[PDB]
Symmetry: D2
Subunit: 389 residues, 4 copies
Amino acid sequence: KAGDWLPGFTPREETVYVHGGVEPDPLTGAILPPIYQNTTFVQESVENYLSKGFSYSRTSNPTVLSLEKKIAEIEGGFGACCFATGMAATVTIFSAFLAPGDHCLVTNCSYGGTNRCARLHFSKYNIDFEFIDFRDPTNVEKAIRPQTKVVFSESPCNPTLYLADIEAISQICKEKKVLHVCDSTFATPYMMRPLDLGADIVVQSTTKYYDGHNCTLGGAVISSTKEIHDKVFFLRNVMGNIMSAQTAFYTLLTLKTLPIRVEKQSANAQKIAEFLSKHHKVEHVIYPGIPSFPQKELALKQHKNVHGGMLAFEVKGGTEAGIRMMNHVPRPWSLCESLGACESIITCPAVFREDRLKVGITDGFIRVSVGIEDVNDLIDGLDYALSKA
Amino acid sequence: VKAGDWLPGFTPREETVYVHGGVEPDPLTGAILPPIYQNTTFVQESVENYLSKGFSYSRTSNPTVLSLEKKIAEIEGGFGACCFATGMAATVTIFSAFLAPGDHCLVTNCSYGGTNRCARLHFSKYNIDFEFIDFRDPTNVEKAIRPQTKVVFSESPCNPTLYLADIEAISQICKEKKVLHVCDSTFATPYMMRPLDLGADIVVQSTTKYYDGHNCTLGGAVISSTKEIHDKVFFLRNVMGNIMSAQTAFYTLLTLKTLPIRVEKQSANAQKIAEFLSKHHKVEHVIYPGIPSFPQKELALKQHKNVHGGMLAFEVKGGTEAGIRMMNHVPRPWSLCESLGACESIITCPAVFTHANMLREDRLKVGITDGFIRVSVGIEDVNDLIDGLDYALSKA
Amino acid sequence: KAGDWLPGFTPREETVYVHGGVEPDPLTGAILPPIYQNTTFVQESVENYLSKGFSYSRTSNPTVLSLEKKIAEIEGGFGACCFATGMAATVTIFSAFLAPGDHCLVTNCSYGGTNRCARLHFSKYNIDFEFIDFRDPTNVEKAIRPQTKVVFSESPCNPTLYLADIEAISQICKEKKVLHVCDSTFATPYMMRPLDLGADIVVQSTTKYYDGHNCTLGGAVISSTKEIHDKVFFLRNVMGNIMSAQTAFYTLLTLKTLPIRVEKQSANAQKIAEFLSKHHKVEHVIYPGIPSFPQKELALKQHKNVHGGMLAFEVKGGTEAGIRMMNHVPRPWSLCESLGACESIITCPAVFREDRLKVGITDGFIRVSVGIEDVNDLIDGLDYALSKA
Amino acid sequence: VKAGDWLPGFTPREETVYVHGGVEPDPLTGAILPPIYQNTTFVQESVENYLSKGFSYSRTSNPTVLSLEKKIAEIEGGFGACCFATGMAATVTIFSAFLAPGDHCLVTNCSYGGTNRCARLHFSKYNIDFEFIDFRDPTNVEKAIRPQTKVVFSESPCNPTLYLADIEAISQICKEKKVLHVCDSTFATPYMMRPLDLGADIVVQSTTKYYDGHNCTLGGAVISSTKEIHDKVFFLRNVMGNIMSAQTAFYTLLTLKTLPIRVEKQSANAQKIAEFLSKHHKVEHVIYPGIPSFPQKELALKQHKNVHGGMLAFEVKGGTEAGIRMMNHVPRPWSLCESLGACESIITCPAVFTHANMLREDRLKVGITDGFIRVSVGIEDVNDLIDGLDYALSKA
Ligand SMILES: *Cc1c(COP(=O)(O)O)cnc(C)c1O
Ligand SMILES: *Cc1c(COP(=O)(O)O)cnc(C)c1O
Ligand SMILES: *Cc1c(COP(=O)(O)O)cnc(C)c1O
Ligand SMILES: *Cc1c(COP(=O)(O)O)cnc(C)c1O
């Protein structure tokens, strides 16, 4: 009847982004879930405690739970836990699955915050973090110790856009009985679902593409099994780092357009990468959709639908040229941190060294987050900025 | 030219305006989205610099609402815009500002039901004569204009029959006869049709529908062609206390950024659904401005840019019983409910849901038949949407 | 049992402010009502249309309806309708109950907006508005015509704080079969409930005291009968001027503290009025709690609990002195419009004439909205401002 | 001195600080409440003026959150404050920043259950030794300090037994032995007790409870006595990603304005309820710091300003069965649920609701008995509250 999914059918991809994890409010029929902006939940009696499923919003909240169900469906997981930020999701992984004496392999071109929270904080608990090059899966295979509990990949990596072969790394981790965690923030599940490729856990900064509007901060942990999910949920309650109901409402809203947003962003990004690869003031361009991409074979194997909204490039002249460019990049570009949004964002990490170069972050390196503006405004602005470099 | 400046002498392209129009980073903090001014009153520096920072009281104007207004005026091509609590409040403010006892007002006879009602049931008690006519032929409008006519109120496409009105032709008639042309282009969106570009004097929008597009907020907008019209609307909005709230304006500032890609996806889905329905052996008629049998095809091709919209309609064979049974059996992802324009596909019967206070005889005279079904297409996978309709039609 | 009011008992005053019109969410037990930030409501079938009570948020919304039930209980009415602003509530009254040829009596010292929306707008529909002095009920009795449909009182009046004898005016209106509408925004229902005194309709700007935090705009119409309530509700749907769910949530929150807020504000106001009445630069002080108040007998008859947070005074020296004072009133005072808030507000209407004087608004007249700051900071600041006058 | 300025050389009085602390009218518009910065990232003018307007990314700092932080630091009497998603996140950030393998940490054995758990169940796996002792006698703390002790974590009053700890005496001991004194004064609020005034090094607050006081938001705060401590907390908050959101900070900026009058009303109600319970023939024991039989009366009178708080506890005669029956029969306006501090009066059994993972033997050793009932008093009419309790007690 009306209001039911037909039994035995599974919604197709875009339908899940619109409707996944949500049904009309049973009480009123409201098409969107109400915002449970409240801390505590009244119990019918001492015996029917938790009979309606909730007690305290630090532990679980109905709006947050609806978003978690949607995210788990989109990523292909058993369940998801939502957090105040992406960093909270990551540090909850490190907190739950590592103890003194354990070993953790982390991609050496990881997002800066992940790298720092490993080196500067968790390492003081006598946890051994080792940073290696994930572009070759045999590097991971050869670096796993008996003490290794977690292999933490990221693909594409921030900011260099290196790819990690998630299926091969997952095979390696399964054989060694090690947890494979994948940060696929830059990919989004519309381009790559690491759980489909054998990862044990996915970490998402929902701040970036899930939101996509520069509106909220948020994080998510999607677990492949009930055992892992239960561990994450328990520790989230202890750490007090759950997402708020209002943030979950915003993200429930913005996730509905993730497919059409990422399609537009990636079409723009392809055109911008093609323009930059012919510009005489540009030394190198990094985009998984152009022929110069070093890991083109893996990109064709691992990416679905698109090649994403992120790109990078190196301006000729080094740091001084990159600075001149950044200082003269006009609207509609925004000069700032973050990525994944409707508003195109550009930044030069160097201005905002030996180890920097060891990563791949060269002096004139520019990270570009492509939005959904008209691509001719974006290209015209980059062309003008380059004329000052 | 430095970071934070636009290139001088360039007009930003359309999609850029949807993302950035009316909005710059916060001067104080650089926040990429301007903050929500969730506050009622504004402190003044002194008596002599009263209103020197531009604001006094949020019923009169609010900074978040004003940012949204500048963006909407830019998108619709107007001098200025006023934002309201609902689309109906926008419409009522136009009737309140531009009509007085003794005046005559031509309204499309297939107007959105609420417009028809607030005219017939409320403003008519002030001895304003509302005449409801067929706007499909602009000469009907020309020769229905009496010397008391002050306002011509068109809608295109019409809710729910999707009749079109030739906005450019009607505006030429209205300028010749010195009458105000107001056009409700809620169903079109400015991505498909901008009445101000076609000579209308005022545009009214229910931002509830496509501007929002997420079933999240209520809102309305009036976009005025001139400063004289805009100032009248603004003054009366302050008197009637029906301004939009800062929080609603923040939501709409956010959702408007994706209006082009949303409407493109909705319209692509709607074309495929209308083709599917037009071949279906249990469907009597299909109405969609983009299918080749559309009766006003030539006007649609003249007046619609990019797309033919997310709205369609159809009649199921068998009359009322079959339409009711089809409604009761349409599965998810469809939603059975009122409203339209949203990411979530919606289906309804205008006979019960919206045009219920229109007596059946007039209901039919309009075009709202027994088996008539209004469809608002969202952005789900079109194959899920068609699967659901095909199941419901097989049950009908 | 737990979760039930005991049958046959009525909650006392302050309990209604905390809990009136609201019960824990039946679905989850959430102690606060969820925010129904949604426009439309899914229907079970064509036959069970409106079976769950909602269809479209312009017509009715669950959060708004909870607030309406609370407000109706607090004011002692059959029902309430909530609006985007106080002015929307007022203009809905004028729209619903007046037609060409009708006559409307309005207090001549009404809030400026009410006066203007009558004179400048509704008068163009051939509605005859007559402004008279409501301090004497026999003025109302003698001014009622056969065409009179509405008598619109306000007590205390903005800004002069004149009182209207609501019970006597109601008796007069009942005998003439005329609708008595009362704007009791300045009083709040904690000090005066016009429905208890025989008024037919109450109008509230919830912006002022119901909110009390300078946070939201809002309005309410509380009707004494189902017939009146139904008329107001129908026209609200036509006018499209309903309150939003988010605003209703804020007001559901802030109404809980209205009694303790108004108690503190009124204690401060009494002390400030006593200070000003001894200051040599102050010509007159207007406060219903000091002995100089002209309508002291009516204030003692008509006011409950307190004498309110509003006061007024005239500085010696006229307009120039008032301006000097306003320009030198220090924090914690705020120089701005509105009233009723935690933050003390001061304004001089003259700077921000014959008819002005006809009202009672003299040149050096200052309207003071007392907040909940420490009264010694407030008095010290007024003393300093006066030293510049 | 002009409008918008404070009088120079005057310290604003306490209630004024609750209304206005940390907040001035918006410089750009004069908005009396500063807007909600609902945005993630902040645009920079150039490379060389990076962070010149003070913000870059909302995980690190946000303008609305920073306004709330300045207000909280002013109210609690600290150098600075950091705001967090929850009280538990504040507490966990303190344990994460100031403890390392091999360190010893003295915690009150009647600490709030979540604190006890995150110590025992999580941080202990890093080879941090948490020792749980009786803080009612400060010499217990003095002689329990081992040379590995880095942190002494007190709570007063304790959740749920309402035991007090002599904050000034414990701080003197901690300064003599060069150990960090952290105090959770959630149950007290700064209106009743400011641990930083009494020599504590750090205060931790669950703003969820009384700062909010309306059951609306979750939140936490860490208030630091010095710049060195504050900078450590701020740095680690950015690493752990547990900052408060702008919307929650806006809500708390609003609710904090009424904290004094709320706590005054709650505390007046609570005194009357505790007196009523102490005379009731079906009540075994009543615990409230303001009734004359309170065991730590002298410390309460030394350490509590204005009030003795909204929290009380009692045991019903008959043990577990009678307590359960009383719970199942307490009517509205009471609410049966977790949490505390709110306008809405709340009642619960810590045995099931909060301290359930504490085994019964330890449960009793603490003071959490079978018939033990924790009561959070709101601002309803006290006669309705007493009526409800009297009915429930008659059913017990
Ligand atoms: C942004 C980012 C993070 C951190 O998420 P936050 O929401 O900023 O805390 C983690 N991983 C990647 C790849 C990121 O881009
Ligand atoms: C929805 C609608 C309106 C009324 O707008 P509301 O936001 O519902 O008040 C007006 N015109 C059209 C064409 C509509 O569809
Ligand atoms: C403020 C006010 C109004 C108008 O209410 P708004 O919410 O500002 O539209 C009406 N009556 C009185 C007495 C007022 O003070
Ligand atoms: C509530 C509570 C906490 C934990 O705070 P949350 O906001 O629930 O994370 C800490 N200490 C005390 C005394 C508490 O009552």
